[PDB]
Amino acid sequence: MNHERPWVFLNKVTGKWGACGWQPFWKATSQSLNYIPDNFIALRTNGSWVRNLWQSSKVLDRGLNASGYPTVGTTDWVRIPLDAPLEA
Amino acid sequence: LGHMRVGALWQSNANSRGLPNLLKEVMAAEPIYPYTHPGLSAKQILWNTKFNLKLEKDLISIAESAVQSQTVNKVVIPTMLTGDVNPKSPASVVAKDKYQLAKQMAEFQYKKSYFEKPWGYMFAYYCDEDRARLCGGIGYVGHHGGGDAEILSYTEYVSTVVYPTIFYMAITFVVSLFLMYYYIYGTFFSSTRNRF
Amino acid sequence: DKGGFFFGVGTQLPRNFFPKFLATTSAIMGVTYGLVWLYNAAGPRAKTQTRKWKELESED
Amino acid sequence: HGSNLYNRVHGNLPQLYVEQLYNTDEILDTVPHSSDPVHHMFPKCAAASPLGFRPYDNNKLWDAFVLWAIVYGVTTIFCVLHILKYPQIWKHLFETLTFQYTYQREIGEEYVWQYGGGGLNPAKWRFVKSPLEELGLVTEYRSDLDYPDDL
Amino acid sequence: MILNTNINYGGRNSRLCYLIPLMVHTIFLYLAYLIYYNINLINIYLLLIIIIFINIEWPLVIIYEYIYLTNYNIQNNLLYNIATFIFLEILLFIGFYWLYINNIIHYPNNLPYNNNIAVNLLDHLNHNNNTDICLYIILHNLLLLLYVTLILQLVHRYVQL
Amino acid sequence: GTNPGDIALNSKRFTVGKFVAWACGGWGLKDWIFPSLFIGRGDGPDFDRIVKHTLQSSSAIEKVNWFDSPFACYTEWFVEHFPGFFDSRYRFEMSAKTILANKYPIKDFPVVDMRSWRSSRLFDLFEVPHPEHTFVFGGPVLLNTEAKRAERLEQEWHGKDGTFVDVHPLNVATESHTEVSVIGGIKVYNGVWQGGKDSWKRDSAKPELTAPFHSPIWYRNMFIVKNADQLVEHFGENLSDETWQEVRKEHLAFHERFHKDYSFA
Amino acid sequence: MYEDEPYIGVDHLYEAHKGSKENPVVVEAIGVHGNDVFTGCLGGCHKDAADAVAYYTIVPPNTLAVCIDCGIHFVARINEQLTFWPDGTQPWEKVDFKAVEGFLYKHYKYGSPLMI
């Protein structure tokens, strides 16, 4: 399995943000004793995106100029990656 | 033959998992010398290590020469019971006068601030982490226990739970005996009704 | 909160598991009772179990 | 688990592993070594659980067949042999379960029905007609099936 | 140099885990076949040769394990097992004696002949006398077995001392 | 938990695996027609819960060395399933650092893992599935073999006198000691070399090679073993009972905002 | 009869008990180097600890462990039972460190068979 790392949707008109990502699921059955689930939302990463989101929350909520990021389809939403902390 | 191992150095297997290095687990990717040698750079640490190493060599040489070339004026042979491998330790760990009490109180205050509360918080984290490891459908966390559990001592439990239960059981026993005998036979002491 | 309506995950039960369990088991028992009634009302019988026979036999 | 022959031969008493040149199974018929790997009970589960996987995947035909044989193989073999040896018994079972065999049933009769309460008590029983014939699904009862005469 | 494990006999894999069961199966099917067709599928001498050959494995493994794997814990286990086996044999004999004496302790019996007194000179000892049981030879065999028991006990103690 | 493997080949509506499960067990038409009841939410990471637990955290999330540790691959599991994970982890790491910055020469660190749990039944101490061969090198060793035996009862069982069990001849001899020292012109005899049990102190600690001789630093990992069925802990000299009760109260008071918004139903 | 026996002297009021952080309970098992040691209590080393049955423990070797049920510090440790190959070639008189040095070097570097 390999999907996109979690991102942040940001609405420019209303300045309304929120994290998002692909979360897999599967039919529930017995678990495994010798296995602690790895990082399935941000695959092959040490899970730093939580820290990056925590640090970027103050900036995003304060207000950010989203003209420098790609749009989503034809709507007023833009994607901000969480591969690195956001400082602007 | 496949991938035969070369040598017999330690490998983490089912029979052995080794002794964890908590210091490296916690201080991962962070230096330790800012805490053990505050304010010193690598060159200063190395220079200090060299100086102290030479000094220790000199002191060790002096001490060995002294102990190995001193005349014996007295011989001290401690008293022990027969069949005993080693003499009893003459050191006591209990304060005797008030000055020792004050000294041990100061030591206890320091240890509490600097060695005991850290242990307590580490253990609390370990317990919560074990809960998290067993959570999520892997194990039986949350099936019983919790902080709302009512824990009673042996005396309290036996006095307030066991004896009343047996009392109720005895009363139920007598009442059921009488009611069942009446129900079947229709009398209390005369066997079947309208027959005898 | 995960898993299905009737099943949970591993060793965790779904929310309100026991009322759902009782309701579903009651439904299963009802269906089985219906099957028994059907097999008795349409399966093999004997001429001695008819209403006329049984009612004439009961009296004396 | 990989073999340990290098360590065994280079170890401390190599003369004990000379037999390994002959027809020998290392896991079963060789002197254990202090550095040998730890052998687990069910290697398939022991290797699959730490990865998060169950031993058998239903997509693979080999895995599906192996698991079926483990769980259902012997019971189905027994049932098949029983069916071959006693074909009439299963025929009778199929006839009865599908309302084809009715011992002495008749059209329009009412038959006794009582769930519990002990033996037949005329103060508890009811009488029931056949819903199959009330719905028009059945109008005659077969007479060419096996019949227990002299019962 | 070798690494010493626990005193317990670890155990070896062996073919005796299935050979003895297969031997029992062979014997019982041989009996069934002899019952059905009244003839032997395989010659009885050949069958006994197979049975003997299968069981020669016990003394060999016994020798090579005593030479190498033995101590007092193992010896105690073996002796206790021997005792339990002797107990099982005693119980088997008890069961067969129960079988024998069931109709003999119960004195009354319906007999084809007369056993009342004052009708013939010998009738009064018909039921209480099976006068053909080879008593003299039985006593001779008893003497032989007493010889064996006493001699064996004497020799055992003598070597043990 | 579970590792789904390849999500792609199991999402298809018709699959050999689904048909085999239908035939033998684990799947049926109830899942094809009513997935919302028999599949429903399924089992997997809860992104919304991870975000909530992340944003509820304090600045401890910034100051923790977790993301560089070997357990960083479990960040999402512990963020989701351990409310208040980052604050507790920060307290744990600061506790370790303050033990490290002590004035004592030996820094003792408590270690707790899957082996830290005692049990009355031996099969509970092995990893699952159990190894093929267990207790090859003998069974457990009881600590009680190092306690003085019941001498009085032992003598009494045998019908021995045992009157003077507590009266022993004194022994003052040079022949009874192997450890001899010369301390300021005094030849002190004291102790006998016993073997492996006399070197427990050095074999348990590891030195800091850069620390000078006049200010030694030793690191010791103290293992912890508990029953988990006791409900009361007695750490001994490492932690007093009053301090432990204080820590319990403070821990339950701080880690309450992370726990109050959830029900256990 | 044991619970009402007296202490011998007033030492127990002053000394450090057996099982202190400085006077631990050291125990020795046999096995392979580095293998975790199986040890245990018979129960009830403390008033608040269970005593119905023996309680077992799996602990790393040559490390200071603390039982926080009773509060006792212990030093389970392993000694390997390396012995001469018993085939009749064992030595009948005092042996020196050379041949033993070779055998020990080989055992440490590669390992040796088990007497099973």
Added chain:
Amino acid sequence: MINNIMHMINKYTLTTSHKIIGILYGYMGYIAGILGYIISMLIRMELNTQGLAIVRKVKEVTIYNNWITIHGLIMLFVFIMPVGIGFYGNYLIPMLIGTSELSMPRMNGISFWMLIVGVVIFVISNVLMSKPISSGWTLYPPLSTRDADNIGVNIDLSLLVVHVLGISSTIGSVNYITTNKYNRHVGLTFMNINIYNFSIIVTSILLIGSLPILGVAITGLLLDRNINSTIYDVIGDPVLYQHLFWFFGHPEVYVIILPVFGLTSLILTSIIHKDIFGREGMMYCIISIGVVGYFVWAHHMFTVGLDIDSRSYFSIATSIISIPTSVKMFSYINTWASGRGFRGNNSSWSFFSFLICFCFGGFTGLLLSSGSLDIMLHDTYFVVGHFHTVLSLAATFGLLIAHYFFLPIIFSYSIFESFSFYHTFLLLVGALLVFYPMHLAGLSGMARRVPEYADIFIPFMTVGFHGTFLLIFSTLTFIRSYFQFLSHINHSNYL
């Protein structure tokens, strides 16, 4: 590859390892249990329907008799002893006393493969040969020996199967006793061993003493059939056969039940986080039940014409054996109190059902103990209700406790609790609907071992029909749950 195939076969055929032999015993036991359950479903379908719906002839009722006899034998000797004793006895006994293997390692493999040859002979005789044995699991002569429908060699092969099963059990018993006596780690006294070990020891002592007598009885049957002797014919004593058989018979049932008590106690200690209440009392009660069981055998023979004083004695002895079982039940009830047993655990709820059903079965069997009252209850469905609410509702649920406990430990995967709850609840309800009515059917006068009953007994069999449908549902759920246990996910997508 030939090497890999031979390695697997040799791994499972040359083995002398207690864990491997334990899992083999468990697998064979579960398979035999499923086969017996299928045969029982055929029996129930024969009973549930009027007019000989399945056999269709009075001349062909020998098929029904074969069904009952093979059901009894399969379920007793091949299902519950290989699972209760063979599976957990080999797997755990060395582990709990801290040793490597059982003493006499080879005899363990010999025992398992003796069981296998017994199963093979039994299945081939009763499935692939015509007119099998039709005399109930108690092979009473002269029905077994002098009967038109019992002349083939299938009967003799079945008797030899009984012999081989006895041999296997004796070997296992001797091995267990010897290993427990001498192979305990230092510091573990004999009476401080785990309670399961003591129950296994007493079961082994029971088997050793009684099996040779059964061997003698079965050899008597074989000789009557083949050598044409009159051991049990009109000039013989069928009562002698019954005495020998039942001298083996009751120790067998206590052998079946005691290991379930040991397992339940062990698992309780594990899942309630508290020690057994009165461990010494429970162990002493176990040994007392074991010893007392050797003096009561003839309570199965109150109607054959015993002496009146012997009838009185056997009723007295049965009451004596009743006492310690009550002590054990009280100990369990007090053990569960003040514990922290998991509240969503199939093991916990199976323990509840085990306790309740065993108390009910014990009371019903205590009614049968009285000789006089056994005049009205011998060879009725009251006895079937008794030994099915004991065997099929208490011993079975003890094995379910063990199953839902030890699976995560043997395989390392958790248990689907909701699925297992469906299985256990439906098994409980379905069984109670089949067996409970039998009691009131026995009092009313219905006889056992009959395929066709009078019209007075309709309601009991209608309730039995309901119960049989529920049982089919439950056992299908069980087998499907186990298949799902070892299978990876089958659906997965993105949310």
